[PDB]
Amino acid sequence: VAFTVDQMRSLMDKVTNVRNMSVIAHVDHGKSTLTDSLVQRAGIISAGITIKSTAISLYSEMSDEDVKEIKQKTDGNSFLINLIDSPGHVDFSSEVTAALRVTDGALVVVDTIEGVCVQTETVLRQALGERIKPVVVINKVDRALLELQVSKEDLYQTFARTVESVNVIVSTYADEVLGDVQVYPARGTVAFGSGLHGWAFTIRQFATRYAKKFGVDKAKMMDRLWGDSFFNPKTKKWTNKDTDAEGKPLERAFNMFILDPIFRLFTAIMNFKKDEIPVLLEKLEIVLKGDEKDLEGKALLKVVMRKFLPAADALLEMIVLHLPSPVTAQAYRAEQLYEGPADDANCIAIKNCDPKADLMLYVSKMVPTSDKGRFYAFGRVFAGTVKSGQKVRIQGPNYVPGKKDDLFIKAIQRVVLMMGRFVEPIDDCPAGNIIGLVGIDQFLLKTGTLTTSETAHNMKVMKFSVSPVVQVAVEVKNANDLPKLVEGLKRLSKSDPCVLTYMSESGEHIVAGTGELHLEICLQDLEHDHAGVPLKISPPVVAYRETVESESSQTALSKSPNKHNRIYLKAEPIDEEVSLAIENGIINPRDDFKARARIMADDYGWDVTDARKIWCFGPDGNGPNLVIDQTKAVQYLHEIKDSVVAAFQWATKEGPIFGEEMRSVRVNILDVTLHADAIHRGGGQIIPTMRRATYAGFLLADPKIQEPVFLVEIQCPEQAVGGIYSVLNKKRGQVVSEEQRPGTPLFTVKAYLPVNESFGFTGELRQATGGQAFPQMVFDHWSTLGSDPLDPTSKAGEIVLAARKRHGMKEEVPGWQEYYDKL
Amino acid sequence: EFLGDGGDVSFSTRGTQNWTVERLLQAHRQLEERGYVFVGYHGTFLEAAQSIVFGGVRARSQDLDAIWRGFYIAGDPALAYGYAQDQEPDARGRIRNGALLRVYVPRSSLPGFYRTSLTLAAPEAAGEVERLIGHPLPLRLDAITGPEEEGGRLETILGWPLAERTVVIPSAIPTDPRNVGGDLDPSSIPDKEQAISALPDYASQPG
């Protein structure tokens, strides 16, 4: 239905009547199909900016009678359901947790024949870890009848085992505090049906029907519809034994009043017995509407079943009557989501979902919009109320109430509703809802916390990283479409914050991502959408870094082509601390040279003199490398600065060991000799000189290369934890810590995994831990290899040689003499 | 077409596309067969390189009052090498490498190539060059070869008329994309190119 901003807003005020959930299900189990059905049924539409569908709004109403069956404070008969989107494959670990972390309920879809598959089993565990209440649905029942032609009782036993498997998981991993959260068909928290045909039901639905034909308060009618309850046709009595006085068998209630009606329509219709179909239909009060009347076979059944048991409503019934509101859940989920004092003024505000308290808005992800290459923040308001124009404190990943690091006190440009693909402006939004924000893109990379309390900690952060550690070269197989590639690359980088596209000096087009899969996906979407033009992709490669271990053996020197200008310099190492400081905004390029100097001098042991002479950082004008002007009385020096800097940008972007980026490299310009006339001191002249000197210096300062390393966090049952250490030991992995979740048998191992050793990691971990393991890995740090990159047989040199060959460069590494003056 | 055969030739920072030593050899042999001779190397930028090989060398708005106007080249690729690179930065700040060109003139012009020991800029140069060529500068259908500067390597200045009659093709000597500013490395010159790189013997006395 269509709603106005007011209606929506009004609906968002009754949080007790809101439901934040997700759909946990394997894609091959009608995940997409079932979800649609809810959209095609209760999808909310508003009465020119498009976005990437992240959440769908659903509306549903119920009778004052139904509202009562809700064992949780409510108000009104209207309900707002937020269907938050989930990934297709489990490998997307990090974003699976993202969706879950903002939901309270969950619609777990299980298959009739196959039951609970491994994958779904795993995600369900994670959901339980976030304290999500599950509600089950056994889909694909049709496949049971049509294919297996199973009997009423065998199909029953099936569901039984299935529901049993699920609860084995639910009880083993749900928190004791939460209380019994197992699903029980008799209690209306398990629906059965078929997404294909579009039907589904709950014991509670047939119980409201058979409700009076027997003189029963449905409470006991649905209680009988499952388990061991029988109705003797003859005695016309309800018994609790599968046999009558003599010993003859008795059909269970479920098989009698539920499975039988359905089983006949199937048998009637699929056998084309036109004499029965009409009779059978009228009895169930199923009125075909003109055109549908002529249908027969699947076509018909498909239409009958829809009018009979509308799949959409069965699911929408469970969502409202059993899934917790953003009020019930936050009371027991707050502590877990706040990384501050469980009694902190905010943590409390979280529990009480108080719209009056200081803001506590959680940003789960940044979504691409049409309005430029801008991104809108997607999240949930756990406390207080967010409103357009309101200025907020944007607390990033590294923030800590104590310091001022990673903070951005800005103003929220606009608040909008994530109506799937379209956004709808709204003044404010009280705690308990999923909302969208406009104007944070340049403050939050992906995840983050927005507050108002100056003493507010961040909420359970989700480690993400923007460090390009894997990349490839893209080429067009048919040269004609080249411009179409030049466009999609620009298009791709615009859709994702963490992908990167650029051109190397060699003129190649590069695509770099967060990991093997992340890039993998990026590449598909490029050859299929953004460019849709056939491409030649190069094999995966790990990005390294070129660095120095000491000060240049001796002064490095180079002169321009003119032979009139000279640059004298030396290179020296930068402390990992400083580099990190630079990487983490502490030491900033845009800062006041004086303030910045004070910092480096004080907190990092740098001579305030040198620090005040910083000429630039690099690459990209902000990398962890510096050029320090230690010259003394060099006339015209400033007239060559831009050139010097420019050169430094290229020198640091592609070093001399093998084209990789420099890291933690210090360049001190010792002396300079310049032609008196500017004409001869142009860029064409200085730029190459500095570049060469730098290289020389570099090669003289004892060269070394760094390799990136991941920090992988793994969830896994004590039983399978074996496979973990197993694979970690064949990848040079380093265990950092292993803990257990108090109650359950769920260990959580954390270790370091060398990026250049992580190719196909998930695939191998799969086999190893019987698929019970759930990975979560992010870039952690750069490791300086010990071996000499210059020695071909060494370990680093091996990397270098291969890389060099790959790039078609001279197999050997240039000695410093090649860049030093040819004197 | 003097480029031998084997697919479109282009100039990249990456290297000259489609130009093996073998092809060079064929091109050179066939230029001789039509009566052309190699007179020197000419380094310059990729864009430029392209214009000279497909469109030929052409003067364009020279300073008529500039008496040494012409097309400079060199017998020694190393000296040519130096000019194989952008002379200024691109907007971003990149100075990319260029390419070495091999210059050939119709054998029929050799009668106008002269040599001297004076350094072309020197006061005497002017007069002595003119003495050798039979007319006042600039050079026209003639060429002068002499020290780039005292003790330096030798450069050659074909007059604009002669230069417009040249035929230039790519060299098998690559420029280094990762060392723009370095001096040509003697070992990167192919031996086979060395074989076909002798220079004609220029006259030291007027005609």
Ligand SMILES: CN(C)CC(=O)Nc1ccc2[nH]c(=O)c3ccccc3c2c1
């Ligand atoms: C001002 N520019 C259009 C270019 C210029 O004045 N000269 C230029 C441009 C390219 C040149 N290339 C050479 O190989 C060469 C060899 C010996 C002596 C000079 C050159 C040479 C000279």
